[PDB]
Amino acid sequence: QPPNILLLLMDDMGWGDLGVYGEPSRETPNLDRMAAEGLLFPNFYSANPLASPSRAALLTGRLPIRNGFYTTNAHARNAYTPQEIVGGIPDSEQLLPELLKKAGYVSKIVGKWHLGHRPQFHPLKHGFDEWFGSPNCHFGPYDNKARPNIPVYRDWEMVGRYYEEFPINLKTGEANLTQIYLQEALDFIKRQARHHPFFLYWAVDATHAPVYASKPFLGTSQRGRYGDAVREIDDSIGKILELLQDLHVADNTFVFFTSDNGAALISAPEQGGSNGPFLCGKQTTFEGGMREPALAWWPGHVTAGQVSHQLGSIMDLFTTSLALAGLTPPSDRAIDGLNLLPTLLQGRLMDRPIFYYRGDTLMAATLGQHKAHFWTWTNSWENFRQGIDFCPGQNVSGVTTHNLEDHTKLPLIFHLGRDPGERFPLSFASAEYQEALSRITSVVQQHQEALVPAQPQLNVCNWAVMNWAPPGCEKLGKCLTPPESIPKKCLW
Amino acid sequence: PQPPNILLLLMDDMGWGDLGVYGEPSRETPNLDRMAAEGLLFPNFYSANPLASPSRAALLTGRLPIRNGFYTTNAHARNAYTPQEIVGGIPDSEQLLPELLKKAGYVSKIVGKWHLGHRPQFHPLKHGFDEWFGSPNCHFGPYDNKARPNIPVYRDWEMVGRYYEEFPINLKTGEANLTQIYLQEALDFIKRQARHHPFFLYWAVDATHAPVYASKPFLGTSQRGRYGDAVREIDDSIGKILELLQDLHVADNTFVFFTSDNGAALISAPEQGGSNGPFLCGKQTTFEGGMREPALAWWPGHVTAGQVSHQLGSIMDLFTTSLALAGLTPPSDRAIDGLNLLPTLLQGRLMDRPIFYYRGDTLMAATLGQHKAHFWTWTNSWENFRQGIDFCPGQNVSGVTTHNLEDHTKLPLIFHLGRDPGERFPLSFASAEYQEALSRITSVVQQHQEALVPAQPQLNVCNWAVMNWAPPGCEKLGKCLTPPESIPKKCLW
Numbered sequence: 011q012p013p014n015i016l017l018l019l020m021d022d023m024g025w026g027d028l029g030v031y032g033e034p035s036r037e038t039p040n041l042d043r044m045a046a047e048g049l050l051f052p053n054f055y056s057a058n059p060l061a062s063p064s065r066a067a068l069l070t071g072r073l074p075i076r077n078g079f080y081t082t083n084a085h086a087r088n089a090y091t092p093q094e095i096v097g098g099i100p101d102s103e104q105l106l107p108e109l110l111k112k113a114g115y116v117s118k119i120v121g122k123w124h125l126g127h128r129p130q131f132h133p134l135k136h137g138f139d140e141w142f143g144s145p146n147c148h149f150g151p152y153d154n155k156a157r158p159n160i161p162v163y164r165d166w167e168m169v170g171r172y173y174e175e176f177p178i179n180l181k182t183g184e185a186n187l188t189q190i191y192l193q194e195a196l197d198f199i200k201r202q203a204r205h206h207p208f209f210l211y212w213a214v215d216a217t218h219a220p221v222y223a224s225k226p227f228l229g230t231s232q233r234g235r236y237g238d239a240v241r242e243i244d245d246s247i248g249k250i251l252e253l254l255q256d257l258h259v260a261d262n263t264f265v266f267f268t269s270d271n272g273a274a275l276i277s278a279p280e281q282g283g284s285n286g287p288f289l290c291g292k293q294t295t296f297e298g299g300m301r302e303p304a305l306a307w308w309p310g311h312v313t314a315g316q317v318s319h320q321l322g323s324i325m326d327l328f329t330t331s332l333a334l335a336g337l338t339p340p341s342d343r344a345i346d347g348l349n350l351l352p353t354l355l356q357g358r359l360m361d362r363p364i365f366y367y368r369g370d371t372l373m374a375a376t377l378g379q380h381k382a383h384f385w386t387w388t389n390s391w392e393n394f395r396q397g398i399d400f401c402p403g404q405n406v407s408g409v410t411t412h413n414l415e416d417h418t419k420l421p422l423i424f425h426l427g428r429d430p431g432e433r434f435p436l437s438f439a440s441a442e443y444q445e446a447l448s449r450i451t452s453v454v455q456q457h458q459e460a461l462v463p464a465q466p467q468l469n470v471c472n473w474a475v476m477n478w479a480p481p482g483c484e485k486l487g488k489c490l491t492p493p494e495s496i497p498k499k500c501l502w
Numbered sequence: 503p504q505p506p507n508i509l510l511l512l513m514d515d516m517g518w519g520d521l522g523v524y525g526e527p528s529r530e531t532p533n534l535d536r537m538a539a540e541g542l543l544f545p546n547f548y549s550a551n552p553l554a555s556p557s558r559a560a561l562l563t564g565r566l567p568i569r570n571g572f573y574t575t576n577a578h579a580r581n582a583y584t585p586q587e588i589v590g591g592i593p594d595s596e597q598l599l600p601e602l603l604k605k606a607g608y609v610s611k612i613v614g615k616w617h618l619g620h621r622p623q624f625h626p627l628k629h630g631f632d633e634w635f636g637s638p639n640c641h642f643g644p645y646d647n648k649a650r651p652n653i654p655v656y657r658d659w660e661m662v663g664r665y666y667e668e669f670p671i672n673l674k675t676g677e678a679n680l681t682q683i684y685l686q687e688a689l690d691f692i693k694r695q696a697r698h699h700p701f702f703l704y705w706a707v708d709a710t711h712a713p714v715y716a717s718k719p720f721l722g723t724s725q726r727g728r729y730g731d732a733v734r735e736i737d738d739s740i741g742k743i744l745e746l747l748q749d750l751h752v753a754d755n756t757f758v759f760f761t762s763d764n765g766a767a768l769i770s771a772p773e774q775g776g777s778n779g780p781f782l783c784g785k786q787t788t789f790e791g792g793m794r795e796p797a798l799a800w801w802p803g804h805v806t807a808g809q810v811s812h813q814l815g816s817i818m819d820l821f822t823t824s825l826a827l828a829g830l831t832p833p834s835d836r837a838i839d840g841l842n843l844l845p846t847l848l849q850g851r852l853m854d855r856p857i858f859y860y861r862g863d864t865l866m867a868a869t870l871g872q873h874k875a876h877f878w879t880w881t882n883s884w885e886n887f888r889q890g891i892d893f894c895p896g897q898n899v900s901g902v903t904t905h906n907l908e909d910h911t912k913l914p915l916i917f918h919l920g921r922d923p924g925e926r927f928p929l930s931f932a933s934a935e936y937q938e939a940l941s942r943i944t945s946v947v948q949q950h951q952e953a954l955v956p957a958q959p960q961l962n963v964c965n966w967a968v969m970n971w972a973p974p975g976c977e978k979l980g981k982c983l984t985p986p987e988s989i990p991k992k993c994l995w
C-alpha cells in the first residue's frame with residue numbers, strides 16, 4: 011500500500027508567521043512540534059506572488075507560464091481567478107489527484123480551489139473525489155445585484171453562500187469555517203484509513219483578508235485577529251496530526267505544510283502576516299513575496315528535527331507525491347517540480363534554480379546563494395499614492411522602485427546568505443558578481459529557449475459568468491438573475 | 503549547601519536575528535540551538551543601552567547608565583562610550599557583581615572585553631574580579647603608536663601585549679586566534695575552580711565587533727561571510743564550554759546565561775554586521791533592533807528544558823538574579839533596576855515590569871506589556887546620514903525613523919509590539935488603546951523619573967594623554983610609549 015499524502019496549504023502566511031521560524035509571540039506550538047518531529051526548509055519557495063497561479067503550480071507541478079495562469083494584458087501584472095474570470099485550469103493540464111488515482115488513491119479538496127469557478131473547471135472534473143469549500147475568496151458581503159455572494163460547495167453542488175448560510179462577521183471577525191474545514195479533514199481521514207490510500211488537499215484561508223476565527227480563538231493572540239486565525243489553524247493542524255497517530259497510520263502518512271505566497275502586507279498589522287527578515291511581501295518577487303515556511307512530517311521515514319537548505323519549490327510537491335505513490339511525472343511535457351525524496355529521506359542536496367515570475371515576466375532567479383533581479387517593481391506610483399504599500403517601512407535605493415525597472419542587461423544580484431533582506435546589491439565590477447551572472451544567465455537562457463509559453467487564461471473577464479446560479483441553487487431557491495454583458499479585457 | 507556556579511556569556515553587537523533558533527535563515531548556530539532546547543528562551547529580552555560600555559556597566563551594576571554614570575551630558579541624547587581617551591569610568595561608589603559575589607565565596611574571572619575604563623583606577627581586578635584575560639577596549643587598529651597607541655591585552659594586573667602586535671589581527675583575511683584563547687581561558691578557569699570554589703565567569707567575547715575576526719579553520723565556512731565565521735566560532739566555543747561542564751558533572755550546579763550587549767551593528771552589514779530579524783534599525787538607536795537581544799538560560803535539572811518565557815527581561819536582571827542564586831541580596835542603599843528572575847526561571851511566573859530605553863541623558867521610550875511609547879525619536883543627524891552612515895539600511899517608517907531628534911513628550915508614538923514588532927504602524931491618537939497605554943506607561947515613567955537622581959556623568963571629558971601609552975607591565979616588555987602633551991577637554995561625540 012502506498013503512503014497517504016496530506017498537503018496543508020496556507021493562504022497568505024509568511025516566512026515569519028511560525029514560532030520555530032522566529033515569530034516573536036511564539037503562538038504556533040503544534041507546527042513547532044511538527045518541525046521538531048520532522049524537517050524544516052529555510053529556503054523554500056512558492057511559484058508566484060499570489061494565490062491562483064501558485065495553487066495551479068502546486069497541482070500541475072508547472073509554472074503559471076506553462077499552465078496558463080497568467081495575463082498578457084500588460085507586462086508583469088499579477089492576475090488571479092476572480093468571480094468574473096472566463097478562463098481557468100485547462101483540460102490539457104494533468105493535475106496531481108488525476109494521476110494519483112492511477113495508484114488507487116481517494117482524494118479530497120478542503121477549502122479554497124481558486125483554479126476556476128465555472129462548471130468546466132470544477133475540482134471533481136479535475137481528479138478530486140470529494141469537495142468542501144469555495145472556488146473563490148471569502149470577500150463580501152455583496153448586494154446580489156452587482157455581485158453575487160461567493161458559494162460554498164459540498165462536492166458537485168453549492169450548499170450555501172458566504173455571508174448567508176456561512177456567516178462571516180466583519181465587525182468581530184467571527185466565523186465557524188476553520189472548524190468545519192477541520193471536521194471535513196478528520197472525517198475524511200477516518201473513512202479512508204485502512205481502506206484506501208488517501209490524498210487530502212487541505213487549503214484553508216482564514217488567514218486571507220478579511221481574517222476570521224471561531225469564537226474561542228478570538229482575542230487570544232498577541233498578533234490581533236490575524237494571529238487568532240493562525241492560532242486556530244495551528245490548533246486544528248495539531249488535531250489532524252493526533253488523529254493520524256491515534257489510528258496508527260502516521261508512519262504511512264506523509265504530511266507537508268506550506269503557504270501559497272508571502273504575507274499580505276497591505277493588510278498588516280491587524281489582518282496580515284510577517285515575512286520575518288525578508289523584503290516586501292505578496293504581489294512582489296522579492297524574498298518576502300515568494301519564500302515560504304515548509305515543514306515535512308513522516309514518522310519513521312523523515313528523520314526528526316532536521317534542517318535542509320535544499321532550494322525547494324511548491325511545484326516539487328507534485329513530483330514528490332507522485333514518487334511517493336510509485337508513479338512518474340508526465341513525460342510529454344515540461345515538469346518544473348523535482349522529486350525531493352532524496353532530500354526528505356537521505357538528506358541529499360540538488361543544485362536547482364528558482365525562477366521568480368510576475369505575470370508574463372521572469373523577474374528574478376536564484377542559484378545557490380545568489381539571486382539575480384532582471385526586472386524590479388513593487389507597484390505603480392499611482393497605486394502607491396492611493397495608500398497601497400506592498401513594502402511598508404521598507405525602502406532599498408534603486409531596488410524597491412515604483413517603475414517596472416529593466417535590469418536585463420545588468421542584473422541586480424544579491425548574496426541571500428549574507429544579505430537575506432536584499433539590501434546590498436553586489437558591485438558590478440566584482441568577481442563574485444561575474445561568477446553568479448554567468449551561472450544564473452546560463453540556466454535562465456536554457457529555461458527560456460526550451461520554453462513555449464501557454465496561452466494565457468487570465469486575460470478575459472465577463473460580468474455574466476459570476477456565481478449567479480451555481481449548480482444546486484434551484485433546490486435551495488438561491489439562483490440570481492445575471493446582468494447583460496459581453497466578454498472584455500480584465501483591468502488588472 | 504555550596505552555591506551554584508554562574509557563567510555569563512556576553513556577546514558584542516550580536517542581534518535578535520543572529521541565532522538559528524531565533525530564525526536566522528542559514529541556521530549556523532547548532533550549539534546555542536541545543537542550549538535553547540535544553541533550557542529557556544526569551545523573545546522579549548532587552549539590553550540597557552544602544553551601545554557597549556553603558557550596557558556592560560548596566561549588567562555589572564544592575565543599574566541604568568543614568569544611575570551608574572555611563573553617559574554624557576555634552577548634548578541631549580548622545581551615545582557615548584569608553585574610548586582610549588576617556589577620563590572617567592566605573593566609579594568606586596558602584597558595587598559590581600563580582601565584588602558582592604565574593605561575599606558567598608565565589609572566585610570570579612573576566613575573559614575578553616571590559617569597557618568600563620582603561621585607567622589604573624578602573625581595572626577590573628580593583629572592582630571584584632580575581633583574574634583577567636582580555637582588553638579594556640575595542641580591537642580597532644592598527645595604530646601608528648604616535649597619534650594613538652595599540653590597545654593592550656591584559657593577563658590580570660599587567661599587559662602581556664598589544665593588539666596588532668603580540669596579538670595579530672589580519673584585516674585583509676580576518677584571521678585572529680583570539681576567540682580560541684578566550685575559549686582556552688574559560689576552560690582552564692572552569693577546570694581549576696570545579697570542586698574547589700563556586701565560580702563566576704564573565705565571558706565577554708568580541709570577535710563579532712568590527713573589524714570582525716575568526717581563527718583560520720572557521721574562515722570562509724559561513725554563508726553569512728566573515729561576520730558569520732565569527733558567530734560560528736563563538737558557537738562552537740560555547741558548545742565546548744558547555745560540554746566541559748557536563749564532563750565534570752558540575753552542569754547541574756552551573757547556571758549559564760547567554761545574551762548580547764546591544765543590537766546588530768548595521769553600519770557594518772552585510773559583511774561585518776549582524777541581523778536584527780523582524781525589528782527596526784539596530785545599534786545606536788532605541789528602536790527594537792537596537793536593544794532587544796537573544797537570551798538563553800541553561801541550568802540542567804533546575805530550568806525546565808526547551809521552554810519559552812515572554813517575561814520582559816533586562817540585561818540588568820542578571821545582576822540581581824546571580825545574587826539571588828548565591829543566596830544574597832542586592833544593595834539596599836540605592837536604586838536597583840535588575841529584578842530577580844528566579845521565579846520566571848524556576849517556576850514560570852510572570853512579572854509586570856517596565857523597559858526603559860535610554861539614549862544618553864534622555865529616556866527615549868518605554869514598554870509595558872505589549873505597548874511601547876516613544877517620547878523621543880532619532881536615528882542619526884542629517885549630516886551623518888549624508889556622509890553614508892545609515893543606522894537603518896533599507897528601512898524608513900514615516901515620521902518615526904527621523905534624522906532630527908523629535909520631541910514626542912506631549913503626544914508619544916505608541917506601538918503594539920505583538921501586532922507590529924517592526925514598529926511600522928503608530929496607534930491612532932484618538933483610539934482607546936492609545937489612551938489606556940499612554941496612562942499606564944506615563945504612570946511608570948513619572949514614578950521612575952521623580953524617584954530618579956541622575957549620577958554625575960563619567961563620559962564628558964576626554965584627554966589624549968590618558969590613552970594606553972604606558973600600561974602596567976610595559977617596562978619589562980620594553981613597550982612603553984611617550985605620550986603627547988595635552989589638556990582635558992570636552993569629548994566630541
Ligand SMILES: CC(=O)N[C@@H]1[C@@H](O)[C@@H](O)[C@@H](CO)O[C@H]1O
Pocket residue numbers: 060061062088090122124146147148149218293
Ligand atoms: C482567494 C483570494 O482572495 N484571492 C486574492 C484576491 O481576492 C486579492 O486579494 C488578490 C490581491 O492581488 O490576491 C488574491 O490572492
Ligand SMILES: CC(=O)N[C@@H]1[C@@H](O)[C@@H](O)[C@@H](CO)O[C@H]1O
Pocket residue numbers: 553554555581583615617639640641642711786
Ligand atoms: C569596544 C568597542 O569597539 N566599542 C564601540 C566603539 O569602538 C564604536 O564602534 C562605537 C560606535 O558608536 O560602538 C562601541 O560599542
Ligand SMILES: *[C@@H]1O[C@H](CO)[C@@H](O)[C@H](O)[C@H]1NC(C)=O
Pocket residue numbers: 177178179184185186
Ligand atoms: C458557530 O456555531 C455555534 C453553534 O455551536 C453558534 O452558536 C454560532 O453562532 C456559530 N457562529 C456563526 C458565525 O455561524
Ligand SMILES: *[C@@H]1O[C@H](CO)[C@@H](O)[C@H](O)[C@H]1NC(C)=O
Pocket residue numbers: 405406407898
Ligand atoms: C527611497 O529612498 C530613496 C533614496 O533615499 C529616495 O529617493 C526615495 O524618496 C525613497 N522612496 C520612498 C517611497 O520612500
Ligand SMILES: *[C@@H]1O[C@H](CO)[C@@H](O)[C@H](O)[C@H]1NC(C)=O
Pocket residue numbers: 670677678679
Ligand atoms: C594561530 O595559531 C596557530 C597555532 O595553533 C599558528 O600556527 C598560527 O600562525 C596562528 N595564526 C596567527 C595569525 O597568529
Ligand SMILES: *[C@@H]1O[C@H](CO)[C@@H](O)[C@H](O)[C@H]1NC(C)=O
Pocket residue numbers: 898899900
Ligand atoms: C522616508 O519616507 C518619507 C515619506 O514617504 C519620505 O518623504 C522621505 O523621502 C523618506 N526619507 C528618506 C531619508 O529618504
Ligand SMILES: [Ca+2]
Pocket residue numbers: 021022060061270271
Ligand atoms: Ca494567497
Ligand SMILES: [Ca+2]
Pocket residue numbers: 514515553554763764
Ligand atoms: Ca557592543
